[PDB]
Amino acid sequence: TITYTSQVANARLGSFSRLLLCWRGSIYKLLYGEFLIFLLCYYIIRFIYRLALTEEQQLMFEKLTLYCDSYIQLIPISFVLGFYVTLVVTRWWNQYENLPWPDRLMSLVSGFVEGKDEQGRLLRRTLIRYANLGNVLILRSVSTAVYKRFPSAQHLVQAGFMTPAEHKQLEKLSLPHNMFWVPWVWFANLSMKAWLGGRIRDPILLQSLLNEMNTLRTQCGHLYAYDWISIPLVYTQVVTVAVYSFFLTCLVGRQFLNPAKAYPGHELDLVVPVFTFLQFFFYVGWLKVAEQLINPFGEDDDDFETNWIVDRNLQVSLLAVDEMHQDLPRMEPDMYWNKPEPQPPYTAASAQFRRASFMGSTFNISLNKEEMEFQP
Amino acid sequence: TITYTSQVANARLGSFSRLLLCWRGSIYKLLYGEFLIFLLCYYIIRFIYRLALTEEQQLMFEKLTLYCDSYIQLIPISFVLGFYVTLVVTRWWNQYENLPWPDRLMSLVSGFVEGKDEQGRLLRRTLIRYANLGNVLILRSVSTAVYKRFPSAQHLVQAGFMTPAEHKQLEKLSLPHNMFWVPWVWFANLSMKAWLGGRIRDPILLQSLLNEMNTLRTQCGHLYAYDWISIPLVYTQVVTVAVYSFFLTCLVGRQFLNPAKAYPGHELDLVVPVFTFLQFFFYVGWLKVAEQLINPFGEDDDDFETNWIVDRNLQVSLLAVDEMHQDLPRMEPDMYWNKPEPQPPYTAASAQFRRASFMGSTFNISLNKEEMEFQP
Amino acid sequence: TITYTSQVANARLGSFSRLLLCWRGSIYKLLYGEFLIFLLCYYIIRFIYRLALTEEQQLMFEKLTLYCDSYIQLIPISFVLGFYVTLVVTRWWNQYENLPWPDRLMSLVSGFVEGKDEQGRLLRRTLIRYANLGNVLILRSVSTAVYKRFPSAQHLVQAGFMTPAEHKQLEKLSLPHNMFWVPWVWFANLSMKAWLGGRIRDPILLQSLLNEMNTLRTQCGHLYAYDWISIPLVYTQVVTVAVYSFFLTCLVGRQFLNPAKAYPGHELDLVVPVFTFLQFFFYVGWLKVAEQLINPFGEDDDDFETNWIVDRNLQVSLLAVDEMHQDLPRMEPDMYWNKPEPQPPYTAASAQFRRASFMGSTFNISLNKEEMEFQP
Amino acid sequence: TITYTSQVANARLGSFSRLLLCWRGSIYKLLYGEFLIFLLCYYIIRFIYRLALTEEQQLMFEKLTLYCDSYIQLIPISFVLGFYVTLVVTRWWNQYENLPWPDRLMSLVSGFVEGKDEQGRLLRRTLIRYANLGNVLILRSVSTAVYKRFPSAQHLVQAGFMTPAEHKQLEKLSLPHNMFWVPWVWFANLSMKAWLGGRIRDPILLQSLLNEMNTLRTQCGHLYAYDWISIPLVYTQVVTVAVYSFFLTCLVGRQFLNPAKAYPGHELDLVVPVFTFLQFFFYVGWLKVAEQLINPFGEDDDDFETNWIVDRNLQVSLLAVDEMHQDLPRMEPDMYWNKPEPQPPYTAASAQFRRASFMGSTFNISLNKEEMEFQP
Amino acid sequence: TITYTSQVANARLGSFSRLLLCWRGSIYKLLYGEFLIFLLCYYIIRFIYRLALTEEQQLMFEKLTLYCDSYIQLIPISFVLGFYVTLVVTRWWNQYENLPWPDRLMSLVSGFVEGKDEQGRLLRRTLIRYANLGNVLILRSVSTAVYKRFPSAQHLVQAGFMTPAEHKQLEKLSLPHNMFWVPWVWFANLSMKAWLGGRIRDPILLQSLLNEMNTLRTQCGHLYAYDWISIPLVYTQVVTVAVYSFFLTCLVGRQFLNPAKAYPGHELDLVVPVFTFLQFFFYVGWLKVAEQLINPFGEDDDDFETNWIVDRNLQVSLLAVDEMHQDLPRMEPDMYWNKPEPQPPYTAASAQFRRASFMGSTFNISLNKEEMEFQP
Ligand SMILES: [Ca+2]
Ligand SMILES: [Ca+2]
Ligand SMILES: [Ca+2]
Ligand SMILES: [Ca+2]
Ligand SMILES: [Ca+2]
Ligand SMILES: [Cl-]
């Protein structure tokens, strides 16, 4: 993930211009190799046409170049790229929205599962660990970085996400499909045991716990679905064919013909086809947006930081359910204890942001005394 | 389903280029027959024009060819294809999202329905079997592969999805519509019996069970709706007419006229209309995306693997509710039992993915001492 | 509703081509009258130009024809049609999604409302009948077919949807607005009475019943809203003006001028403007998609089968709550009672659909022994 | 709101054509003034060019006219209008979806709050009145028609929406922001009092009441947000600039030059630029769609009928909670009491809508005896 | 936020025209600097071409100018701008929808947490303060204005949002990530303590409180996600490159060549390229829409008023939970106590908005006596 949110907080002069001076996650980094290949092919064709071809061969090549330049169209490519990239971006954000966060679940586990003794600690930690284990089980299934961190279940054991007993239990239950769903059954059964054992005081709290857990399960299932059901290969091939056919045609139709022939539009022979290179940057970068985002769990610069998410979730959830259980700051009257209309101060840098309340769009409507009188 | 997610994890050089070397689920496989027909017709027209037609007939055909090539437009076809294919893809993903998964339901059934005896096993298995039976009842209604697996209800009995008693009960209830809804009524009544019989301890657990079951019912109803309410036939015919009229026009307007006439744009007579073939690939593949996805429960390469889903759901749900009921791994203190800030290790291949936390876009804003002072 | 889902299960050769041989719900049926009018006007103009007009008049008409043919543009029409038809289709599917189904409600009513005696039967049947009565009350408000079936409330009484006592009660409550909401208040009060009377055992079951009922109410309210708040008339008039202005212009700009004048592009005088007719089919059918779908509760071929839905809902709901109440198939051990890994068989026609499980996109990643070692 | 749903029930001959004969909410009513201004300016320019300008001045004006007519483009205007109007229409429907309806809430209040005495009546009426008061408080904040009906809180008191005691309480709580949220706090506290006082029998019923109330609060907050957060002014100005620049250019580039000069495309001097007027109608009406819908709570013909909604909600909710409380029609066996397969009759006008059930797209698949045999 | 809702209530003559006379949040304010730079560069190029260049150099520059003007295309730029700006606007509204409001939570806290003594006041105030503290913690993480108001946690203490004890507790829990989640764990634990202490009477009320709190947590997490996961930098760079390449090309291709050469389209040498400036305004303002909205928590005119939201939320929530707890207006019979059909009056200015109820689109259908007869 490349974050530039702070750089575009305000619409300043050349706001998006400055973003052109970035390398990581940039268009240049993504398409420099393709551009080099295209440039080499273009100039190889130029040299062949200029030197190797004879007079009649050169005339044939010139006729071909005019014919090609006539057959270059940018409407269909723009249409297909726009629609396909819109789909890819929508799926990319949907895949982010299905990354599980244990925050709701950990708050419920910390509040509801009672006991400051070693049994209560163990129970809360085990429940939140089951949540985290399901999450990383799915993430290592779908993310190459997480997989490289945990290439086997024994790596999960060594990293503390799973205990040896849990690993043995998983081995016992082995089915010929992904076992990422098992920690949810474990969580449900352990929560039921906690309720029956008196650690959870009321069944409605148990229902809340299991509802949050099931929300996490639905998110992980959506992650699995996105990993499994790719965008149809035919659509991807169609957009790829459109782009690459356009630029294969450009390789010939954008050659600088010999000026002496004085063909229409070829009067001046510049060596560098600047507009064709700009079109390459535009269209191939538009395609590279999809190429990077189509699988957001790879290792691109703009792909999600799954390993950081795993680490943060583990730390935060364990802290929330273990150290923060029934550990509250002292409850004392606040600064506005007897202030009916609290007005927190503003700093010098923020005083300009003090605003009057918006009362509605009808507030300033003006009516006469006659207009405002109720009729019978 | 053709999965190429691992191949597009990163935006590598020619990432989408390599996908052009795939056959299953490919554009080539989908439109090779249509392309062969188009090619044969094009060259039949070419031979007729070149040999059969007389001088005046050839001049008439040339005038017709110019007139046709003038009347070929790619804006409306791109518009209609983009919108129609977007609709088809949206419905395709919506239909995936309505495939029922018993995972939430099976976790609840495993946790809440109590008893390790043969009655508890039977009750849990029967409930989850009712869920699975409703699912396959709808799937065999909407999926041709599942139907070919279970062409009759007796096949469901032979496959273990339904018992003979359940088959007799279904026959007793026969109405002149699809009976996929019956297992939900059965599930509700059996859950109520379990609660009244003491197997379910609290009515809120019963409400959770029935909420998950009703979610599954809503998904199955959406599957039925998508199977029943097709995209309006008029829209499909409109897009088909657009595409096929375009290429019928191309059959004449893209013929290579005799060079001796030296018509504008026909100076060089290549035999193969390469750009017209590229346009065929592009547009007809764009249409074939919709043709494949319009009914995602057929037998195309990219259609959903419904039979695998049925098998996996049966296995996983039965295991979850029967063997995993109150069968938990030993609960022991974890590796970070007294570690306030757990830091799971990284491998050599994944050390590069260790990241500092993103603290927010306002973290690095700089303010002077005067700026940060509160004003009265 | 015209269902062709089975015909497009697979992307076969000419899959959408075969759909051009359909009449019901087809483009031909929808626009043949408009096409006949357009054809008659076109040829009337042709005959007037060819016979009535004098030499100078013919020259003026030819200049007008060139001027018109120059002023024909297909970009704005495609834009507006695409956006407007997308909106219409979105609203069409939203209106389908708000058709109420009593399946969740009937399952809850069958399970929760207890008693096999005549009072329990009457209570369950009355509750589900209130649901069905609200549904048909709204449907006859919004659907012309349902209205033609039930043109008055006395027709509802004669058809069994409402009792004479309910009709009298509705008459007593008459307000100067649609009374489709009354059965929901009746349902709520009757459910409360059932709970207070001991027929519903716990208030959480009552909350479930009323939640499902309120979901149905929200759907019916959305149906009312779609019936009431039409797509803004100005937008519809704008799209209509675009289409009809385009083809009014075509009536003159697409006339076949006299060849002897040898105008550019008019060298050959074919009598039938085939491309203009194809454009008519395309654009007017695109508009007819919206014309058919703008009100999906009319009597078009592709409009919803509301009467069938009403009948099916009544039959299914009454059967579910009355005959299926606490009437379960015998609960016996299933075929996989002691089979840890059930494998339901495949038929000969379906053996090809047996698939190996997809384990995730990271499954086949390869790492060396050094790469997989945890670092300190 | 202009409702034409009944007029477009079926896709009849010239279905959208007849809608061109409507005045209220029409394109003509919306843009006749702008069209008159444009027409006057166009013909003023025509007269100036024809009479005032000298020969050299006329030649300069002709060169300018050709230059302008060359610089008129309809692609960007169509793009921006389509996207902007799509956004406006989406927000318009979202704003409708956030209009609060007390139907779910009034059903719950009627059912759950017990007591046929004057205290129960007062409690139910007060709760539903708090709901209605919150609704109109927000509506008069955002709707000009409702504001004109209730230009002050004393008008709310005189109209019966608020009591003098409630007005005094609101005055006591006055904060420098919109107070539309207060009735929700009142409702919550009154419901809690009713539960503690025994009028609400179980806390789960209280939770249902407050959930429905909070749904209404969320809708009212969304109404406030839409009133407050306008579509960014820059976007609106951009689309306005596009449209008006297009037609300012047309004012000169669409002038009829003197035929004697025989400029290309100006051979015939018709006085009325019919196509330019059609383009004006199309594009300016497309913009007027957004102009009307951008604030749907104004007083346009197609703006929402907020006053009717307020009146209907008050009447219906008071009737539902007061007169309909525990007032049910007599519960008697229905017409299909012992009819396992009820078949409500059809009228002569509706017999054509009797349909056979759709059994699924796989129903008619045919398989041989060999194909249907299970394999081991 | 620039609100112009009241100005566009009705579609009046020149409704959007008047919005062109606005400065704050306007296109002019956003792009005047870029326009000045573009104008200066354009006229520098003009002067160089007119004075510095020699005859042959001027001819070369003229050929270059024709070549450039030929290579200027507005289809791809419009496509990419439309799609990208649509994405930006969608994310902008989504980010507004995730701004937390404590209204549902404060109503629940006021109702459910009992006790008019100093302990009950303290408990309610502390809970709602935890909600507000979580909100501002996230807002100061994502909003530059809020950060400038609270550049440190000690500023939060000085402003009354946090107590010194809470600050010490936060310091104790410090992890190397954003700690905005801590107040939710605090809230959950304090609510559990209140329930165990008898201040919350039933666990279902506790479940309601925690559900509302968790909704707020989900909103704050979405705010964090939008702050962290920027729109992919490659997409932004692509759109920026498209726009700036277009106008860099215009800098040369839109120069006014010397009339004496009488080049096609350059007959008249006006000094000001008015259409190019209009295109600049259009396209660069379209881009500036995204530039302003890409981060809606900056300090642009149209960015959200986060500081006002924070202040209003604090004031309203404290008032709701402290002063409004069990403080209700006197409950007395309303004005329509015995009025079965209440009709609140209309004013003279609003009498025109009195409407008859819409009874449904099928109300006015006419049928004969034969048509309405049920058939057997
Ligand atoms: Ca990636
Ligand atoms: Ca398919
Ligand atoms: Ca219809
Ligand atoms: Ca309006
Ligand atoms: Ca901003
Ligand atoms: Cl609940």
Side-chain angles (χ1 to χ4, degrees), chain D residues 93-220:
Chain D
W93 194 245
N94 292 346
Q95 272 174 101
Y96 182 86
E97 277 173 348
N98 283 293
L99 278 167
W101 303 91
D103 292 55
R104 299 165 63 116
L105 180 60
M106 78 206 198
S107 69
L108 293 196
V109 172
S110 189
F112 294 164
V113 187
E114 301 180 49
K116 293 237 215 203
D117 54 330
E118 192 250 289
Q119 267 297 303
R121 286 189 59 207
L122 200 55
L123 185 56
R124 284 189 295 280
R125 289 180 70 88
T126 308
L127 289 166
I128 221 61
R129 277 185 57 259
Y130 287 168
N132 284 278
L133 178 58
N135 295 345
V136 63
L137 278 162
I138 187 58
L139 285 174
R140 79 182 282 278
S141 295
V142 309
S143 174
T144 68
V146 177
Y147 176 84
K148 276 166 198 222
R149 192 174 180 197
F150 309 115
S152 67
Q154 185 58 36
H155 282 78
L156 288 173
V157 172
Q158 288 168 254
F161 284 91
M162 195 189 332
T163 55
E166 285 156 7
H167 188 257
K168 274 142 208 63
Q169 196 96 343
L170 262 181
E171 286 181 302
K172 211 203 326 192
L173 298 161
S174 210
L175 287 169
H177 353 261
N178 203 312
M179 304 304 280
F180 76 99
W181 56 268
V182 163
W184 275 269
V185 181
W186 285 348
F187 187 107
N189 279 267
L190 185 55
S191 302
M192 180 69 165
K193 196 169 103 119
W195 177 53
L196 294 176
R199 293 283 174 169
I200 297 164
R201 203 172 286 252
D202 199 281
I204 72 103
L205 312 186
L206 177 63
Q207 182 201 246
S208 299
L209 281 169
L210 298 171
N211 280 338
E212 292 304 327
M213 201 46 182
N214 273 346
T215 295
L216 292 183
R217 177 58 185 74
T218 294
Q219 284 182 286
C220 289

Side-chain angles (χ1 to χ4, degrees), chain C residues 3 5-6 30 33-34 37 60 63-64 71 73 75-76 79-80 83-84 87 91 118-119 121-123 125-126 129-130 145 148-149 155 157-161 163 165-166 169 173 175-177 181-182 185-186 188-190 192 195-196 203-204 207 210 214-215 217-218 224-238 240-242 244-245 287-288 291-292 294-295 298-300 303 305 307-308 311 314-315 345-349, chain D residues 1-5 8-17 19-20 22 24-27 30 74-75 78-79 82 86 89 92-93 96 103-104 106-108 110-112 114 201-202 204-205 207-208 212 254 267-268 270 275 278-279 282-283 285-286 289 292-293 302 304-305 308-309 312 315-316 319-320 324-329 331-338 341-342 344-347 350 353 355 357-358 361 370-375:
Chain C
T3 310
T5 300
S6 66
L30 285 174
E34 282 96 343
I37 290 167
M60 203 258 187
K63 290 201 194 107
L64 182 76
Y71 264 67
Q73 285 127 28
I75 316 299
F79 270 116
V80 78
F83 281 111
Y84 181 84
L87 172 64
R91 289 167 68 81
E118 192 250 289
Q119 267 297 303
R121 286 189 59 207
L122 200 55
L123 185 56
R125 289 180 70 88
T126 308
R129 277 185 57 259
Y130 287 168
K148 276 166 198 222
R149 192 174 180 197
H155 282 78
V157 172
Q158 288 168 254
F161 284 91
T163 55
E166 284 156 7
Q169 196 96 343
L173 298 161
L175 287 169
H177 353 261
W181 56 268
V182 163
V185 181
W186 285 348
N189 279 267
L190 185 55
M192 180 69 165
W195 177 53
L196 294 176
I204 72 103
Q207 182 201 246
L210 298 171
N214 274 346
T215 295
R217 177 58 185 74
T218 294
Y224 177 88
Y226 276 101
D227 188 66
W228 182 31
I229 314 303
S230 302
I231 289 170
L233 177 65
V234 52
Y235 203 179
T236 302
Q237 290 179 322
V238 162
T240 309
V241 161
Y244 282 39
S245 76
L287 186 63
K288 284 284 170 180
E291 292 203 2
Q292 187 171 225
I294 187 160
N295 184 348
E299 290 154 5
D300 296 312
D303 284 350
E305 310 292 341
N307 275 305
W308 176 90
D311 288 350
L314 189 68
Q315 298 194 342
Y346 284 74
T347 60
Chain D
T1 297
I2 304 307
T3 310
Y4 58 97
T5 300
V8 293
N10 312 301
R12 43 176 196 192
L13 171 56
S15 183
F16 282 9
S17 268
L19 296 181
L20 291 170
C22 302
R24 269 161 54 63
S26 73
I27 178 163
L30 285 174
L74 41 67
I75 316 299
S78 303
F79 269 116
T86 305
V89 172
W92 160 81
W93 194 245
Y96 182 86
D103 292 55
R104 299 165 63 116
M106 78 206 198
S107 69
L108 293 196
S110 189
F112 294 164
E114 301 180 49
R201 203 172 286 252
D202 199 281
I204 72 103
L205 312 186
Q207 182 201 246
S208 299
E212 292 304 327
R254 298 292 174 80
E267 296 83 348
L268 181 56
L270 307 150
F275 181 64
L278 288 167
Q279 269 182 328
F282 177 49
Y283 285 120
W286 204 355
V289 173
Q292 187 171 225
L293 270 59
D302 258 315
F304 301 140
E305 310 292 341
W308 176 90
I309 291 168
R312 175 264 175 205
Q315 298 194 342
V316 164
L319 183 71
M324 287 174 86
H325 171 73
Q326 283 305 310
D327 180 43
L328 290 159
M331 178 152 91
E332 58 211 21
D334 58 275
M335 172 191 298
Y336 309 112
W337 176 250
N338 277 326
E341 226 203 292
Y346 284 74
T347 60
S350 60
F353 309 124
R355 300 271 182 273
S357 293
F358 174 70
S361 55
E370 273 53 61
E371 275 162 346
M372 291 151 75
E373 313 215 83
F374 274 132
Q375 309 207 147

Side-chain angles (χ1 to χ4, degrees), chain A residues 245-317:
Chain A
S245 76
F246 178 97
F247 288 107
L248 258 281
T249 312
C250 284
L251 266 177
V252 167
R254 298 292 174 80
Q255 280 294 332
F256 283 99
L257 303 177
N258 170 270
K261 292 279 199 308
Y263 290 113
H266 288 268
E267 296 83 348
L268 181 56
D269 172 342
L270 307 150
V271 179
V272 166
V274 281
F275 181 64
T276 301
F277 293 167
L278 288 167
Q279 269 182 328
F280 188 98
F281 288 132
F282 177 49
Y283 285 120
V284 178
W286 204 355
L287 186 63
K288 284 284 170 180
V289 173
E291 292 203 2
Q292 187 171 225
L293 270 59
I294 187 160
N295 184 348
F297 294 110
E299 290 154 5
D300 296 312
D301 289 337
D302 258 315
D303 284 350
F304 301 140
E305 310 292 341
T306 43
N307 275 305
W308 176 90
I309 291 169
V310 164
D311 288 350
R312 175 264 175 205
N313 283 347
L314 189 68
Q315 298 194 342
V316 164
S317 65

